[PDB]
Amino acid sequence: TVDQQEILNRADEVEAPMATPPTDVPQAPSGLTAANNAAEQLAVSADNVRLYLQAGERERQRLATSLRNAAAAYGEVSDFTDLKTAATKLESGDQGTSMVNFADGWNNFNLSLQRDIKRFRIFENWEGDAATACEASMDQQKEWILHMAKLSASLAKQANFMAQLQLWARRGHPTLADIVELERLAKDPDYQEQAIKLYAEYQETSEKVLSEYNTKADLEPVNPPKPPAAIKIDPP
Amino acid sequence: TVDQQEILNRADEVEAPMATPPTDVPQAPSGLTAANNAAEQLAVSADNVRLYLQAGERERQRLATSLRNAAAAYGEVSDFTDLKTAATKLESGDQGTSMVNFADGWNNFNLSLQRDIKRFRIFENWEGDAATACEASMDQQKEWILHMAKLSASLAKQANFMAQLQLWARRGHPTLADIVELERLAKDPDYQEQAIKLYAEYQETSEKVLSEYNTKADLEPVNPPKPPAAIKIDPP
Amino acid sequence: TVDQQEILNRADEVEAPMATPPTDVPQAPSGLTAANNAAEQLAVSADNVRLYLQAGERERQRLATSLRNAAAAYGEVSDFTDLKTAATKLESGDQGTSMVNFADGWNNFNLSLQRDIKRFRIFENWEGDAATACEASMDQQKEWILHMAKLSASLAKQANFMAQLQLWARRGHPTLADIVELERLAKDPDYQEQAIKLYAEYQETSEKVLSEYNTKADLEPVNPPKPPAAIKIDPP
Amino acid sequence: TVDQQEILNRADEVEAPMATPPTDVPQAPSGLTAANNAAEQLAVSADNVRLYLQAGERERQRLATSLRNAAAAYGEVSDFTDLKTAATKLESGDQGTSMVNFADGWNNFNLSLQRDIKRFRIFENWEGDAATACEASMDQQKEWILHMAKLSASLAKQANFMAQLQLWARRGHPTLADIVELERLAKDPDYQEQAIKLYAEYQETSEKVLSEYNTKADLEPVNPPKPPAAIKIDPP
Amino acid sequence: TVDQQEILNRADEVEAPMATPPTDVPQAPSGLTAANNAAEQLAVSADNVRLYLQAGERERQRLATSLRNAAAAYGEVSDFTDLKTAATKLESGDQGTSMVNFADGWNNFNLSLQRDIKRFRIFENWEGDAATACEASMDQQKEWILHMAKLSASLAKQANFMAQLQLWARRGHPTLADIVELERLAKDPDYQEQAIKLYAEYQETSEKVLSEYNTKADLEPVNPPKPPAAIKIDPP
Amino acid sequence: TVDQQEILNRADEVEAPMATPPTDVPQAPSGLTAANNAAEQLAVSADNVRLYLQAGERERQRLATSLRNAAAAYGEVSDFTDLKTAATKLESGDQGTSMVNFADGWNNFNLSLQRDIKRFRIFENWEGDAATACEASMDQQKEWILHMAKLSASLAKQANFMAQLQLWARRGHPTLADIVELERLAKDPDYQEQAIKLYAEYQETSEKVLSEYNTKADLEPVNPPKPPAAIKIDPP
Amino acid sequence: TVDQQEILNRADEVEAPMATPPTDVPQAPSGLTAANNAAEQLAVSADNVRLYLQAGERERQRLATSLRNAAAAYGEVSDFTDLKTAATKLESGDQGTSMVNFADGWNNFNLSLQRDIKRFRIFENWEGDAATACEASMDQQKEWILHMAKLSASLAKQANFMAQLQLWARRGHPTLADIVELERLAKDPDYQEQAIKLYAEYQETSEKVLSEYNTKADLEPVNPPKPPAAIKIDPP
Structure with a gap:
């Protein structure tokens, strides 16, 4: 006939x-202002994703309620201070370890969402109009979940990008020790022919690295779509 | 039953x-005419964004009013003068510090708008047609707010671009001191073989830098979309 | 109640x-035929923009009339002659100063249009169907004004482009003095080995510069869209 | 009241x-077959543009008639022979002067069409449904005229392109005099080591130049859209 | 009144x-298999274009009949054998002269179709609904004819492409005489150090040229659209 | 009157x-696994194309039946083993001759389909609604046939691509004989300085060639569209 | 008449x-974290594809049931530890053999799905509305099956990509043995001039290789579309 028990089990599974x-x-990752902006952008994007996950949770409760109602349809139930500032900022911070932890967590979440779409599979023994409509609704929830997993992945991808940017900037930029060296070796009045040249080259590379850093550390915000409305089935 | 108090609290939160x-x-950033144009373009774009923010504020008041009405639905409640002119203009101004302050302010505003979309979350205990419609309206307001944050970000991005352009032009263009040097060292009649060559090279690089400056300092205007109309719910 | 005075003040402000x-x-900028074509194209585009501005002015009068009617709804109220020709043309004219004046004027107009969209802001104290419709109409006028400002900007951009093209061609092309030199130094029969070579090189570069000039000086026409029709509100 | 005289004057102005x-x-421009094809393509495109201009003229008469009717609505009123052939063809013809005259004429026509859209401006003192409809019709005619001017411009652009192609090919291709030289200097049996090399190089460059010429001289046809139908207003 | 004679004359002109x-x-152009494929593709495309031209001819007869009916509405009326094979094929055939004759014929047809759209011009003295509908139908026939001319042009363009490909391959590929030379000069046992090197280089270039030839000689088919249906006007 | 015999003849011609x-x-072409995959992909695509051709054959029978009914409407009728494995596989197989035979067959089929669309030409002497509808149906069949010919062409194109890939890989990859040479010349303990270098270079080039081979030998499947349904005309 | 037996046989064949x-x-393939992520992404994608295959199986049962009903319609029926860590991870794992086995299996599945669309061919002897509708439904199932085969192919393609990435990284990255060498040869205090240079170069290349590895090992998820609903035919 009609297996109400299958429907009830699926209702418990889906929510x-x-x-x-x-x-x-x-x-x-560092003390640069663009780095702080990037970290704050990531924090806000993470908060927004968590918020929409709570929305999806509500949609799944409503879907489970509709399934239970559908089941009940059957039966009863030159000074160096700019260079020194740039270098000091660049070498501060944790150099990206918390970014990597963040990215790992969000990649794990990506995968674990992807593993959890069994709860939206089609029914074995249920058929008819209500079953078709509930399957369409579960399919929509599945699509939204996959989109949310993709957003989680993009979140982790951005965090990894920030970590790699920190490494790239750190090996592309003159060290604080090198700047202290260049300054002191400019305190002696025999090398000027060389030190002044080196100062200009450092200051060049530093502006170059920091411009790269500032533009690439401008992260896109992540706005999650709201989950599709669950199908509503009133109690009999 | 129906939690009117949740609706009233959400109405106060949303406005x-x-x-x-x-x-x-x-x-x-400098005395160049394109720089002044860019600064004025930024000022106008900022004014226009502020104006549309006031519009969004009105929409949120109307949405709060509609929520209060919906709640009441339940119960009672060769001369060097061209070069000298170019250089003098290029080294005037504040060299972009006010651009950086502007950009910081607008990036902060970007982030703080992004942090403030909790006020549009779905309801816990409210359901039915009015709740669905009010949720759709809050979702629209949320979308508009995110678009406005994105525009704020683009505003700050343009300001940062202007600051970096000023730096790039300043290190790509012969200094006023270098021009005074070249002129004087051309006042002595032994070096002409060299000074005339150097004058032509400066004048080349100067035209080149200024053409770059003039085209890249042409900023797009920012036109904000008007906020979507709030849903209207009449008093009972 | 209803503030008719706000509506009347806004009607006076909008027109x-x-x-x-x-x-x-x-x-x-020069005597070249493409330059004259470019100047005439700019003049025609400017005339056409001015014409459409007059059209927009009429639309704003009609909008103000509709607002006054809406207010009344409440209460009572080898020879060198080709080279010499090319050079002579290229060094004639004003070399682009009037283009720069033109561009400055149109950039100023761009900005001053952008500053003048306050007159289309939403109403504070007016609400209902007529207010919504009038706000939609003002929003349309605002959109048209922003598009017109963008066209003004593109006009100034083209004029600046023509000025920079004139400079680029002038420093890329052999001078009239250099051509007179090369000719005379070819009047003496000892240098031919050199002068004939130089003549061919000049004639090359000249064809090259003039082809560049002729294609880049082909300016797009500017056709302004007509302003959207104002909303019509009949007198009571 | 209603200014019939304005409408009648505009009717005379529009036609x-x-x-x-x-x-x-x-x-x-030359004797090459692709050049003759290009010239014939240009002639045909010019004829087709002239034909559609006559069509637009009829539409303007009909629009003027409709305006007069609308006014009456108010009151009473190794051998060298392949090289020698290629060179002989390339240096024949007028080398593009008639192309330049053609292009000048069509650019003038472009500009003079652009200057003549005043006749489609909105009305000062006429209003109502017929006025709106007639303004929409005049706007359509204006759009068609601007498109036709753009086609005229593209026609002149193609003619200029053909002239520049002729120049480019003429300075990229071995002269007839150079071919006669190479042949004769190959009539003497001491230089073969050199002349045979030069013959192969000429024959290379010649095939190369002529392939370029043949593909770039393949001009797009120009098909004008027919003018939009004028609005029809019957006599009262 | 109504000029039936104009309509009848236009009916005779259109068909x-x-x-x-x-x-x-x-x-x-050669003996290569890809060349034979290309020639057959061209022959088939030409046949298909001729077939659709006959279809258009029928549509024009029907249009003329409809015009006559509309008129009657008024009144009464290392071995070298792979190299030797490749070279022998490449130098066989007519080397593209029949391709050039084909292309000339189809370019002439292109132009002569373009010259023959006068027969679809608007009417001078005929007006009303039938005239508008017949003009729309003639306009459609004109559009189809222009598309057919464009297809004819593309046909000639492909034929020219095949001829140029044959030339390019012939001067990029080792001659049969060069292969006979290399073989014989490899029959003597003193040069091996050189001949074996040359054999490998030839065999390289030959594979390279033939791969180019085989892919570029793959011609697109040409499918003509069928002509739009003529308007049908029944006899009175 | 109406030529039934034309319709019956066309019905026999179309099926x-x-x-x-x-x-x-x-x-x-070789023993590589990607080559076997490519051959199997081609075999499957060929089978699928043949299947859809049978479908089109049924559609043509139905169209012929509809034509006969329409006619009846009128009257009565370092070890080297990875290198040795790679080379041994690469030099096995038939090196692409069966691919070339396959491609030739499918190109012939392409052309012969293109030659066979006469059977869908318009009618000479048949007119009216049924004739128009049957012509539209034949036109659809013609379109499907041309698409099928295009798919046949793409099939042959892929086969040719596989043959050229086999040749490219064979001359880009170290021979089995060269690998046996390098191994043996590494059995003698005087050359190591050289043989080890050569081994690394071979192993490099081999990985490189095989990666190229494996990605380019990944062929797209060919899915034919089903033929459009024939028009149905019931017997009178 | 109507061959019910054909329909019943096709129903058994389709399911x-x-x-x-x-x-x-x-x-x-290795011990890197990105490699583990890639393997898990592949495992999840494979699971999801298998799930949707079960869905398609249900659709085919329903289609077979509908066919049986349709049949019944007729009759009764500097330390080195970061380098050492990177290298140790890179050389761990199975280096991609299980990826290659995975890819082979999924390519085989691709092909075997492609070979199995005979079951959706059109009917020989069945005609009418039900036959047309059932053919459309079988065509839809065929389309879904081809899409699923394409997804299987993309799955195998990604696995092959991971294997090739592992090889590329392994030959682009300093060996663990080379790192042990460099460390020890840095334990002796005579070579520093060289070893320190080599350490910096290794550490460079290592960061470079690992960044490449981490970004390219980020695999797209595979989401299968659900199969189209089978046509429903009720029993008579």
């Missing part, structure tokens, strides 16, 4: 908790 | 003031 | 004169 | 003759 | 024969 | 057999 | 089991 998203807060 | 946008006026 | 567009006529 | 298009027939 | 398309059959 | 597609099975 | 998809689980 079971999914994976818990990460909650760690990523810190700025 | 609470958001972050205040920055009001500082960015100055031209 | 107040806007900035006056520039009327100066840009001259050809 | 006044516009500029006369050029009628000169462009000749092939 | 007069147009230019006759060429009927010559293009031969393969 | 006459078309060309028979090739049935030969293409073998893998 | 016969298709090929069984592979079930092997691909392991990470």
Whole structure:
């Protein structure tokens, strides 16, 4: 006939908790202002993704309620200070370890969302109009979940990008020790022919690296779409 | 039953003031005419963004009013003068510090708008047609707010671009001191073989740098979309 | 109740004169035929923009009339002659100063149009169907004004482009003095081995520069869209 | 009241003759077959543009008639022979002067069409449904005229392109005199080591230049859109 | 009144024969298999274009009949054998002369179709609904004719492409005489150090040239659209 | 009157057999696994094309039946083993001859389909609604046939691509004989300085060639569209 | 008449089991974290594809049921530890053999799905509305199956990509043995001039290779579309 028990089991399965998203807060990789902006952009994007996940959770409760109603349809139930400032900022911070932890957490969440779309599979023994409509609704929830996983992945991708940017800038930029060297070796009045040249070259490379850093550390915000409305089935 | 108190609390939350946008006026980085044009373009774009923010504020008041009405639905409640002119203009101004302050303010505003979309989350305990319609309206307001944050970001991005352009032009262009040097060292009649060559090279590089400056300092205007109309719910 | 005085004040504000567009006529930067074509294209585009501005002015009068009617709804109220020709033309004219004056005027007009969209802001105290419709109409006028400002900007951009093209061609092309030199130094029969070589090189570079000049001096016409029709509100 | 005289004056203004298009027939720049094809393509495109201009003239008469009817609505009123052939063809013809005359004429026509859209401006003192409809019709005619001017411009652009192609090919291709030289200097049996090399190089460059010439001289046809139908207003 | 004679004259003009398309059959430029494929592709495309031209001819007869009916509405009326094979094929055939004759014929047809759209011009003295509809139908026929001319042009363009490909391959590929030379000079046992090197280089260049030849000689088919249906006007 | 005999003749012509597609099975050019995959992909694509050709044959029978009914409407009728493995596989197989036979067959089929669209030409003496509808149906069949010919061409193109890939890989990859040489010349303990270098270079080039081979030998599947449904005309 | 037996045979043919998809689980090619992520992404994508294949199987059962009903319609029926860590991870794992086994299995599945669309061919002897509708439904199932085969192919393609990435990284990155060498040869205090240079170069190349590895090992998820609903035919 009609297997109400299959429908009830599927209703409990569809609103079971999914994976818990990460909650760690990523810190700025360095002391540069663009780095702090990037870290704050990531934190805000993470908060917004968590918020929309709670919205999806509500949609799944409503879908489970509709399934239970559908089941009940059957039966009863030259000074160096600019260079020194740039270098000091660049070598401060944690150099990206918290970014990597952030990215790992969000990649894990990506994968664990992807593993959890079994709960939206089609029914074995249920058929008819209500079953078709509920399957369409579960399919929509599945699509939204996959989109959310993709957003989680893009979040982790941006965090990894920030970590690699920090490394690239750190090996492309004159060290604080090199700047202290160049300054002192400019305190002696025999090398000027060389030190002044080196100062100009450092100051060049520094402006160049920092311009690269400032533009590439401008992260896109992540806005999650709201989950599609669950199908509503009133109690009999 | 129906939690009117949740709706009233959400109505007060949705029309609470958001972050205040920055009001500082960015100055031209140099004395060049294109720089002044760019600064004025930025000032006008900032004014226009502030104006549309006031429009969005009105839409949020109307949305709060509609929520209060919906709640009441339940119960009672060769001369060097061209070179000298070019250099003098290029080294005048504040060299972009007010642009950087402008950009910082607008990036902060970007982030603080992004942090303030909690006020548009779905309802916990409210359901039905009015709740669905009000959620759709809040979702629209949220979308508009995110677009406005994106425009704020683009504003700050343009200001940062102007600051970097000023630096690039300043290290790519012969100094006023170098021009005074070249002129004087051309006042002595032994070096002509060299000074005339150097004059032509300077004048080349100067035209080149200034053409770059004039085209890249042509900033796009920013026109904000008007906020979507709030849903209207009449009093019972 | 309903503030008729706000509506009447807004009606007077919306049809107040806007900035006056520039009327100066840009001259050809040189004697080349493509330069004259470019100057005439600019003059025609400027005339067409001014014409459409008058159209927009009429639309704003009609909008003000509709607002006054809406207010009344409440209560009572080898020879060198080709080279010598090319050079002589290239060094004639004003070399682009009138183009720069033209561009400055049109950039100023761009900015002053952008500053004048306050007159289309939403109403504070007016609400209902007529207010919504009038706000939509003002929004349309605002959009058209911003498009017109963008066209003004593109006009100034083209004029600046012509000035820079004139400079580029002038420093890329052999001078009239250099051609007179090469000719005379070819009047003596000892240098032929050199002068004939130099003549061919000049004639090369000249064809090259003039082909560049002729294609890049082909300016797009500017056709302004007509302003959207104002909303019509009949007197009561 | 209603100014019939304004409408009648505008009716006479809208059907006044516009500029006369050029009628000169462009000749092939050289003797090459692709050049003759290009000249014939240009002649056909010019004929087709002139034909559609006559169509637009009829539409303007009909529009003027409709305006007069609308006014009456108010009151009473190794051998060298392949090289020698290629060179002989390339140096024949007029080398592009008639192309330049053609292009000048069509650029003048472009500009003079652009200057003649005043006749489609909105009305000062006429209003209502018929006025709106007639303004829409005049706007359509204006759009068609601007498109026709753009086509005229593209026609002149192609003619200029053909002239520049002729120059480019002429300075990129071995002269007839150089070929006669190479042949004769190959009649003496001491230089073969050199002349045979030079023959192969000429024959290379010649095939190369002629392939370039043949593909770039393949001109797009110009098909004018027919003018939009004038609005029809019957006599009262 | 109504000029029936104009309509009848236009009916005879519209169904007069147009230019006759060429009927010559293009031969393969060489003995290569890709060349034979290309020639057959061209022959088939030419046949298909001729077929659709006959279809258009029928549409013009029907249009003329409809015009006559509309008129009657008023009143009564290392071995070298792979190299030797490649070279022998490449130097066989007519080397592209029949391709050039084919292309000339089809370019002439292109132009003569373009010259023959006068027969679709608007009417001078005929007006009303039938005239508008017949003008729309003639306009459609004109559009189809222009598309057919464009297809004829593309046909000639492909034939010219094949001829140029044959030339390019012939001067890029080792001659049969050079291969006989290399073989014989490899029959003597003193040069091996050189001949074996040269054999490998030839065999390289030969594979390279033939791969180029085989891919570029893959011609697109030409499918003509069928002509739009003529408007049908029944006899009175 | 109405020529039924023309319709009956066209009905017999439209369902006459078309060309028979090739049935030969293409073998893998080498022993590489990607080559076997490519050959199997080609075999499957060929089978699928043959299947859809049978579908089109049924559609043509139905169209002929509809034509006969329409006619009846009138009257009565370092070890070297990875290198040795790679080389041994690369030099096995038939090196692409069966691919070339396959491609020839499918190109012939392409052309012979293109030659066989006469059977869908418009009618001479048949007119009216049924004739128009049957012509539209024949036009659709013609379009499908041209698409099928294009798919046949793409099939042959892929086979040719595989043959050229086999040649490219074979001359870009160290021979089995060269690998046996390098190994043995590494069996003697005097050359190591050289042989080890050569081994690394071979192993490099081999990985490089095989990666190229594996990615380019990944062939797209060919899915034919089903033929459009024939028009149905019931018997009178 | 109507061949019910053909329909019943086709119903049994359409729901016969298709090929069984592979079930092997691909392991990470190395010890890098991105490699583990890639392997897990592949495993999840494989699981999701298998799930949708089960969905398609249900659709084919329903289609077979509808066919049986349609049949019944007729009758009764400087330390080195970062380098040492990087190298140790890179050389761990199986270096991609399980990826290659995975890819082979999924390519086989691709091909075997492509070979199994005979079951959706059109009917020989069945005609009418039900036959047309069932053919459309089978065509849809065929389209879905081809899309699923394409997804299987993309799955195998990604696995092959991971294997090639592992090889590329392994020959682009300093060996663990080379790092042990460089460290020890830095334990002796005579070579520093060289070893320190080599350490910096290794550390460079290592960061470079690992950044490449981490970004290219970021695999797209594969989301299969759900199969189109089978046509429903109720029993008579």
